[PDB]
Structure formats: C-alpha cells, structure tokens
Design a binder for this molecule. Structure first.
Ligand SMILES: N[C@@H](CCCC[NH3+])C(=O)O
Ligand SMILES: N[C@@H](CCCC[NH3+])C(=O)O
Lengths: 488, 488
C-alpha cells in the first residue's frame, strides 16, 4: 500500500530523531514494580481523592506497548499494554520535563515505553499512572493492523497483541500439560526422553518424514510414535514411564491436521487396558477440575460431561446399535464385503473382516460419540501391537477414547509375546507389499528386546493438542498451536 | 554361539510346557503391595523371631525379574529384582502347592514372576518373602548376558537391569529437568511449544537436517535452535517464555556429539545479559542443591564449586592471560593473522579480527576453564543475533558459560534493532557464499516481526544434556541419553 509505505517512512524519520536526541531507541534494561493487574488489585479500591493523599506510597514502574494516544498540547494520555492487560498513563510536560516530553511527542502507536510514576484516577474513575519519568524503550518501525483470516496463524505475534482470548488458550495449554506431569509424577511415573530420529520408524500406522545424516551417509526417519523405545524401558525394569513430546507424520493436507504434534505416551508394568481406562478417565477429569474449576466443559455451545462416569462400549456393539449389523455373527470376509456394499461402506478389496468392521465404525458411528466414550475390542487386523482377547481372539484388549466425535486417546494391553509380535510384523509386510503405504516395518532389535522378557504391561497414548482443544473450547488444532503449519 | 542357541531352544520347550500346564505364559495384570525398598523399610528392623509372630500382619505382593535361583528339591530360593532393587523369595512345595511348584521348577533366570507371601529372615539375617502363591508372569526366551563395551548404549534395557548406577543417572536427569521447570514457573515464566519443522532453519551456526513433505511438495528443515520463534512471542507481549525440547544438528561424527539433543531456551523482556548471568548462576546453583544436596559437585575426582560466586571474565582478558596477546590493541585483520601465525593458531584466510580472537580462545583458553566461568564480550563477527556493546562496538553483550573445560550455556542482550539484524543476516550470506556452510540464512518473516517492535530482551540457551553430565558425574553424552545414536 501507498499509505503503509508513508507511515513506515515517517517512523524511520522518528527513529533518526531519537538518535539525534541522544538516546538508545531500542532500549536498555528496565526495572518494573508490577504488571497492570497488580496496579489494579492494589489501587482500584480507592477513589480519586484517596489516591491523592497516598501519592507518596503509590510509586510504580511499568512497561509495555502504546495502544492508544491523545493530546497534542502539554498534557497527554495513553494506554500501555503489558502481559496482564492495559493501564492508562498520563504524561505532563511539567511533570516529566522538556527532554522527556520530546520523547513522548515522538512516541507513536506500537512503540514500547517505560513509565515511572504515581497512581491516580481521572474524573471518569479510570485508574491511571501520572508519569514522573517517561522512557521510549523501542521504536516500532511498522504499525499494527487495524480491524486476512489466516494472518492470526501466519503472524501469531500480531494475534497475541490484539486478541486476549488467544493468550488465555496458550496459558491454559501450559497449565493442562503441567497438571498432567504433576498427576503422573505423584503416581510414581518417571518422565523420560527417547530418540526422535529413528533407524526404523514404528509404533503407529503412518507415513514418516525421511532425512539424511551427511557425515555418516545414513538414512533417518523422524518418529511417528514414542511406543517402541518406551517398551524397551519396561523390559529394562523402569515399570512406570512416560514422555510428553513431538511426533511427526507425513500425511495428507488438512485444516484438521498438522505435520508435527504433541503426544503423551505412558507405560505401566503389571497393568492391563482396564487399569489404563481408569487412569485415563481419572487423569482427564482431574486436569479439567484443576484448570477450569469443573469437569463439565462447554464445547461449541454443548456441555461435555467428564465428571460423571464415562461410557464403555464394545466396537461391535456400537456398530450394531448404529447399523443393525452384528459383526459377532459375521463369519467370513465375503459376508463382510457384502454387508459393506449393502450399507454403503467405502472399502478396499484387500480388506478383511476386521478392516471392514472398523470402516463401519469410522463412517457410521465415530462422529456420534460426543460424550466421553471408551470404544474397545478393536479387531486384530488393525491392532498390530495389542494383545489378543483370550475369550475371543478376533479382537484385542485395546480401546480408543472418543469425545466430541473424534479420537482423543489410544491404549491397549501390550503384546509382550515376541513370537506373536514377529507374526504381526510379518503380516504388516503382507499389507505393505499389496498397497498399504502406512504399515508397520520389521524392527528386529525391538523383537530381540521382547525376547529378554517384557512384563505384562498397559500402554496409553493421548493427543495433547486435541485434549487442549476440548478444554479450551477451540474448534481447530491451529488455535491451540502457537505457530501452526501454513502453506507457502 | 552354539551354547546360546541351545539355551534358547530349552526356553522354547519350557514356554510350550507352560502352555500345556494351562497358564498364560506372558501374564495378566498383577496387583502389588509395594517395591523391595518398601519391604525393607517396614520389616528389616525386626529379627527372625519377631517376624514369625507378625506373619499375620506381613502379607505382601511383589513382582520382578528372576536374577538368581537355587534348590532342586522341594524348597528353593531366588532373588527377584524390581525398580528399587532385589528381595529374596523362598518357595516351598508344601506352601504354594503342587501345581504352582511346577511353575517354580519351570522358571529360569530372566523370567518375570509374581509372589504373594509373608515376611521372614533366614539364619544369615537376610529379609525374604516366604511365598504362599507363586505366579510366572513372563517367560523370557533369551538369557541375560553375564560379566562388548558398546552393548550398554545399543541395548540400554540390558544396562538398566545389570547396572544400578545407570538407572540413578536417568532418575536424576528427570529431577534436574523438573526442578528447572519448577524454578522458572515460580518466577513467572511460561512454558511454550514452537515448531521443530522450519521453513528456514535459523538461530544458530549449524548444518540442518533436511526433509520433504510429500502431499505439499515442500522442503522442511528440522530446527537447529528454538531462538527465532521464541523472540516472536516476545514481540507478541508474553514477556517471560521458555521451552525445553529437542534440537537437531547435522554435524560431524564424534563420541562427544549426538545428532539430536535437548535444549532449554528462555527469553525475558526488559532484561539484559547481566540479568541472565544472575539467573543462570542462581538457577544452576539451586538445581544442584535440590537434587544433590550441595552445589559443590564432584566431576572426575575434582570438586567443581558452583556454591561460591562464579567467575566473570572478558574473552579478550582471558586470551591475554593465556597467550600475552591483548586483542584490544590489535588494530587490523592482518595484525591478527600475523599474531595467529606466531602463536600457532589454526585459522582460515577468510577470517577477520573477531573470528581469530575466538580461535585464540577456543584453542588456548577454553579447556582450562574448569570452575564455572562466564566468558563475555564475544566479537560481533561470531554473534549475529547479539546486540553490540555501546562503549565498544567491536564486541557484543553476550556470554558463554564454561564449566569443566566446555560450553554449558550461550546468552546475550538480544538484537531488537531490525535494521542492524537485516545487516547481520546480509553479512552471514557473504560468509555462506565464500565457504562457511553453517551460517545464518535470510529470514524475512523474522525481520518483519522485529519491525512491529520487540522490547529490550535478555535471552539464554542451556544444553540440558551437558548440565545433566556435570550434575550426574557422567564423562560422555552417551551416558545421559537413554538411546544415544550408534553407527549401523
Ligand atoms: N503408539 C500409539 C499410542 C500408544 C498406544 C498404546 N501402546 C499411537 O500413536 O496411537
Ligand atoms: N540459539 C542459541 C541459544 C540462545 C542464545 C541467546 N539468545 C544457541 O543455540 O546457542
């Protein structure tokens, strides 16, 4: 724009003027007595007349961004924004002196300023700081935008200045994650760090990001999951371990998806998937109560009840409820393919009984699960790391947590049998050769670890970003990431 | 080996025998009353005779790995290892019954077992569990190795079972990191997450790992630092932010280096590098006192004194002390190159005054800094993101922390001037074109962020793995990583 270029030229002139006046226009350190909220908590109780008597005791020092400005004469007003919010400042020439009032006149919207002064109230009752000393801490060379929908994601720093609701989401994200640590640390779980660069990327059904080590001439994959390294630590005897960190998945383009995202994975020796259900339900309920004050949370104008007991439903029973098809009584792959055609379930011809049952669930059931629901009993074909159910080997002791129509957690009784696990890994190569590009690879070192003996173990994975979305009432993953991935 | 293959065949026979006996040889969930240390804390005070009277009150349930075994008759002993340590078990046929004693006979070293029983002591005074119920929880198909130096790194799970000192290092690593969070959270710092996949990898002098997004046909770089995204949050008004996470550097091969490692980066608005010195010194001293009980720590048989005041030394004065060369009085690049030849300092012909001063420091001084030393005043040529010193523009307001002869932290008064920062970025392209492959790229979005106005800011980066090495008395980075990078 022509107007935008003229504003930036004026700001460059004003920068040079500050150099001519003999100050550092990008500032030195600045001591502060408090934030705007501390000033309001301590002084807003008192009236205009009471504050005049307390001027000897109300000396403060604040700093922040100039958001409003008025007064072309010898007295002027402005709103200064810091982390907590805004506070009005009052700058008189007869208070700050001639040299500092030239800096006040130079100052424009967006500049960082420091103010030392005393508290007072205007005739309208607005708590303000009467400046005794004014400091221009940083000259901004570019003005803020006033009144592009993608700018808040591409330039998050502008969103954090202009939108207070955005800042609250990220503060609550930090509290949610820290409350998860505190909960698990109090129960005896050890936080660990495992490699993000894997020789073989396993632990999930997803396409990896590939990279190259130059000095070694070696191919490395960014991790798609934290699973396989954490189960090695269970073989090593650590018993209770977890890890909160980034995973990377090279999947298709979507507003619902991000190439990198934060996961917690957790493993407890001598537990099963029912113990993990209890832990997941208790932990999420606890985090909601501590951060929000209630486990009944609003999501898109609807009350999601995490306080009351969460529903537990077998995937076969969920599909039967929705479609009338009872997959217990389906006896072959051909019968499943026939039923898939009848009920309009999009499938691939390579799919079997278990794959098709899952498509019934994903296409007809999944989205209806608004209240927190543990869907369990996932078929063996889609569950390569989960132990089989003893009473019915078609299904595994696995669950997925569904809230607001989407997956929030994945968990199972772990497969500690290295013979079966070798067999699962072999069957995933059959799928990979015939057109399933996001299938499990052959990790020989992992099988070797299981052969030394892994105890019976319960494992859990929670998508942290989706949990944060739920508890902050955010419609998209781009609202809970500070710098979400944007095209170009 | 032939013997190793025979052992594994015997274990497969024993696995099949357990299936024939009608148990699950890979186990179900197992409730425990405590760890071996809880049993010792509660019961080891009492004598053999006192424990017999308390058998009604001393029912316990434990589980762990079978590490020793003796007794071929109807009574046998074994040591069971859990997270805390080992406890002896005593299994009699007349206590557990015939069916469970067959499982005891089947059990071999490395198997996971569950024992429910009562406390007692042997004639030698060893606290033990007299088994009332024995459970074989997992059959191990491969025996542990007895009495290859790289096996502890390649197979960490074996090291954690056999070496108790290794387990303590990783528990203390977790405490060190959590104590850092607690310290910073109490001072008002916000923990955040920023992208690990960058469009342009900046924030340090290092070669990046390159990768490709398939669905978008876009090139992405794994982050070499956390710096540039965190300073955007300071522009956004968050004031106090930090991030503990992985960075990735595609550098040469070494035992001292790992391709991925953990960093904390921290940024405080309205602070300078002297405030960051105070913070770094206070924080590290605090973490040492809380985790170890003292800030005087042993490293390779030598007392490193973090309790007393840390030394502060200008890089020019450090070089003058070591070599006699005063770089304040060196007036040109040719004089610096001449002095470099005289004192045997390996340099490149493209290097200037500042580059050469640093080589003097790295080759003659660095390794001698055993006690904690803030080296400051780094020259502008090697400090592209640091603000210049006002009194002497040759040097920046930067420091590096040196302990036990190596770098532990990097910090500076941040360059919030977008005109100068553009100029630094332009001068790094001059170095990149003439043979400096680990130089800074041209981030236009970052410059645009600074133009909206960044306040005066102090920034800090600490290598977490090196800090953990110091405080755990570990000689190599591979000793403080659970799964360090190994060739092949
Ligand atoms: N690796 C799983 C999470 C853990 C599942 C239970 N072991 C995932 O990415 O979905
Ligand atoms: N990006 C720096 C750490 C922060 C330096 C101070 N801003 C590094 O990797 O060394």
């Amino acid at each position: 724009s022509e107007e935008m270029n003229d504003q930036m030229l004026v700001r460059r002139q004003k920068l040079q003027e500050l150099y001519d006046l003999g100050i550092d226009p990008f500032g030195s350190k600045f001591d502060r007595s408090g934030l705007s909220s501390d000033l309001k908590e301590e002084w807003d109780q008192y009236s205009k007349e009471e504050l005049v008597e307390k001027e000897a005791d109300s000396h403060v020092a604040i700093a922040g961004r100039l958001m409003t400005k008025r007064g072309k004469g010898k007295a002027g007003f402005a709103h200064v924004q810091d982390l907590a919010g805004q506070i009005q400042i009052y700058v008189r020439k007869d208070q700050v002196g001639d040299d500092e009032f030239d800096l006040w006149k130079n100052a424009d919207l967006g500049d960082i300023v420091g103010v030392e002064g005393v508290m007072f109230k205007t005739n309208t009752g607005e708590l303000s700081v009467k400046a005794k000393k004014f400091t221009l801490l940083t000259k901004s060379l570019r003005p803020l935008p006033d009144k592009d929908i993608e700018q808040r994601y591409r330039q998050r720093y502008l969103d954090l200045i202009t939108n207070e609701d955005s800042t609250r989401t990220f503060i609550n994200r930090s509290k949610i994650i820290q409350e998860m640590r505190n909960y698990l640390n109090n129960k005896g779980f050890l936080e660990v760090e495992t490699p993000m660069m894997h020789q073989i990327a396993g632990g999930a059904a997803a396409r990896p990001f590939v990279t190259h080590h130059n000095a070694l001439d070696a191919t490395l994959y960014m991790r798609i999951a934290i699973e396989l390294h954490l189960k090695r630590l269970i073989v090593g005897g650590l018993e209770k371990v977890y890890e909160i960190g980034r995973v990377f998945r090279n999947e298709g383009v979507s507003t619902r998806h991000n190439p990198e995202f934060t996961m917690i994975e957790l493993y407890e020796a001598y537990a099963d998937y029912h113990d993990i259900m209890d832990l997941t339900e208790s932990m999420v309920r606890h985090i909601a109560n501590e951060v929000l004050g209630s486990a009944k949370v609003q999501y898109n104008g609807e009350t999601i009840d995490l306080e009351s007991a969460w529903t537990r439903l077998h995937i076969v029973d969920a599909v039967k409820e929705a479609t009338g098809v009872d997959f217990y009584e389906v006896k072959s792959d051909e019968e499943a393919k026939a039923l898939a055609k009848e009920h309009g379930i999009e499938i691939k011809d390579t799919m079997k009984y278990g794959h098709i049952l899952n498509e019934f669930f994903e296409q007809k059931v999944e989205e209806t699960l608004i209240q927190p629901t543990f869907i369990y009993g996932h078929p063996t074909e889609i569950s390569p790391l989960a132990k089989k159910n003893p009473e019915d080997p078609r299904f595994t002791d696995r669950f997925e947590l569904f809230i607001v129509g989407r997956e929030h957690a994945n968990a199972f009784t772990e497969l500690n049998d290295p013979i079966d696990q070798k067999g699962r890994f072999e069957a995933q190569l059959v799928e990979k050769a015939q057109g399933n590009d996001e299938a499990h690879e052959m990790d020989e070192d992992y099988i070797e670890a299981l052969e030394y003996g892994m105890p019976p173990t319960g494992g859990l994975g929670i998508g942290i970003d989706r949990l944060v979305m739920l508890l902050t009432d955010s419609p998209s993953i781009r609202d809970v990431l500070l710098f979400p991935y944007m095209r170009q």
